[PDB]
Design a protein around this ligand. Sequence first.
Ligand SMILES: COc1ccc(CN2CCc3c(c(C(=O)NCc4cccc5ccccc45)nn3CCN)C2)c2ccccc12
Ligand SMILES: [Cl-]
Length: 63
Amino acid sequence: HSEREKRVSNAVEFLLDSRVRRTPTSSKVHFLKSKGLSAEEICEAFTKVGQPKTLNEIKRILS
Ligand SMILES: COc1ccc(CN2CCc3c(c(C(=O)NCc4cccc5ccccc45)nn3CCN)C2)c2ccccc12
Ligand SMILES: [Cl-]
């Protein structure tokens, strides 16, 4: 796996956690950026767990 794939895979496992699911999107997005994910990678992770967010929303949170 590439380092990008590891970042996204780790983000997926994070977002699936039951306590994490109850945490607001904003906090999760900030946390995922702090682990080195780009806005596009964050967006990909949310879509892969069936919790899709627009890239615009993710960028708004991080701006
Ligand atoms: C921002 O909110 C939270 C952050 C961390 C936690 C603590 N962990 C929850 C579960 C969890 C964490 C992590 C975690 O920190 N994984 C590492 C990780 C996660 C995401 C991206 C990563 C990118 C590169 C390297 C590691 C990365 N993974 N999982 C899923 C079970 N293993 C963090 C929170 C717990 C409950 C509610 C909110 C949490
Ligand atoms: Cl915030």
